Structures are given as C-alpha cells and as structure tokens.
Design a protein around this ligand. Structure first.
Ligand code: GTA
Lengths: 183, 15
C-alpha cells in the first residue's frame, strides 16, 4: 500500500484541435504521475485508445520534457513510428508501450536516457504510435530500443525511425513512409 | 539506480 516509485515522473497530455488555436495551444496537461499506482489511475480515469475520436491524440512524456519538437530534449531527436493495422488492439498496444516506458524495462540505463515519451494518434487513414527519442544518431542505442518496442508490442510490420527534421518537413496527406533506420 | 518493473509486476499492481 506504500506507493511504488517510478524511475521517472511522467506527464499525460490530450491533444484536441479547435479552430483558432495554434498547434501547441491544442495540448493540455491532464496529469502528472510518479508511482505505479498513479500511472494506472491516470489510464483508468482517461479515455481508452479504442474509444477516442479521430485526430484527438495522447502524449506521455517525462515531466520536464514538453510534448513538442521545440523542447531541447526533442529538437535534435527522432521517433520510432508504428503503423497500426486493422487486426491490432490499440488498447493493448498503448498499455504495453506505456508499461515498457514507465517501468523502464530496457536492458541498459543509456536506453532509458534516450526516452522522451510516447504518442498515440488515432486516424481514419491508419492510426499511429510513436516513441520519441532524444537523439537521431545514437545508432546502436536507437536500434536496441526499436527492437525492444517490437518485442513488447508483438509487432510484425516494419517500424520507422524518423528524425525531427523529417517529421517537420513531412507534408500532411503524403503516403510516403520511410525512416533513417528501419526494423 | 535505475528503477525497473516488468509487465508481470505492473499488471499485478493493476488487477
Ligand atoms: C508533433 N507536432 C505536430 N505539429 C503540427 O501538426 C501537423 C500534423 O502533425 P500530425 O503528427 O498530427 O500528422 P497527421 O498527418 O497525423 O495530421 P492530420 O492532418 O491527420 O491532423 C491530425 C490532427 O491535428 C490537427 N492538425 C493538423 N495540422 C495542424 C497544425 N498545423 N496546427 C494545428 N492542428 C493541426 C488536425 O486538425 C487534426 O485534429 C504537423 O504537420 C505540424 O504542422 C507540430 N507543430 C509544432 N510546432 N511542434 C510539434 O511538435 C508538432
């Protein structure tokens, strides 16, 4: 009953677009947690991935890292992008993903140091999960993180590592999917 | 240092 402390404190954000708000003004921090117990409470008290309306997104980031490219810990970084398929349960994907992150179930300390946060993006065209990392060029560490994600999420399809520069320049609507790294 | 919890433990804490 004494709470179980986590390696990191994390903050949980909902992105909800409304006209006449800038991208970053569409984000709102709905919780900060630092224990296993408060982690699960957050997920029990917020919308399930399978229930969310399209275009309303979930961001979970280490608390001192803002969920935006502009953050120092993000600007020189990149994401592992996961393209969700029709057969996949997004609750399972999200829960497994957040468990991996909050429990810090990486083999090495350095892998945990790379982690910024995770993003769930429900889309009619095909939903996306991402893990944002602090660098775009720590090849070995980035690749072992990508491998661990695929294991935990039981992923079959190729996942893509995309530096922030490529995410920014990416035109909405484009059907091209590529990465600096792939596994 | 690093505080680590596996999914088995995390899920036992949940359910
Ligand atoms: C992560 N991110 C995304 N954007 C902006 O959001 C756009 C869409 O990024 P996405 O990852 O949501 O890509 P996707 O192709 O899935 O977008 P989609 O068009 O399906 O739209 C998804 C939702 O976001 C909204 N949206 C899309 N573009 C913008 C925008 N430029 N500003 C505000 N809302 C937007 C839509 O209304 C909808 O609700 C990017 O092209 C970029 O301009 C960011 N801008 C800054 N400055 N910093 C960021 O970190 C950032």
């Amino acid at each position: 009953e004494f709470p179980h402390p986590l390696q990191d404190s994390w903050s949980y954000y909902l992105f909800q677009f409304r006209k006449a708000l800038d991208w970053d003004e569409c984000l709102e921090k709905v919780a900060t947690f630092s224990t296993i117990e408060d982690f699960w409470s957050v997920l029990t008290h917020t919308v399930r991935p399978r229930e969310i309306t399209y275009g309303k997104d979930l961001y979970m980031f280490k608390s001192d890292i803002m969920p935006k490219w502009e953050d120092p810990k993000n600007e020189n970084g990149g994401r592992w992008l996961i393209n969700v398929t029709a057969r996949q349960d997004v609750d399972f994907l999200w829960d497994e993903l957040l468990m991996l992150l909050i429990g810090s179930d990486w083999d090495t300390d350095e892998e945990d140091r790379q982690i910024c946060g995770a993003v769930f993006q429900p889309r009619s065209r095909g939903s996306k999960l991402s893990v944002w990392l602090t660098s775009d060029n720590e090849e070995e560490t980035i690749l072992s993180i990508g491998r661990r994600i695929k294991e935990r999420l039981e992923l079959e399809d190729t996942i893509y590592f995309q530096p922030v520069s490529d995410q920014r320049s990416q035109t909405r609507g484009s059907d091209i999917c590529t990465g600096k790294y792939e596994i | 240092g690093r505080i680590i919890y596996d999914r088995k433990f995390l899920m036992e804490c949940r359910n």
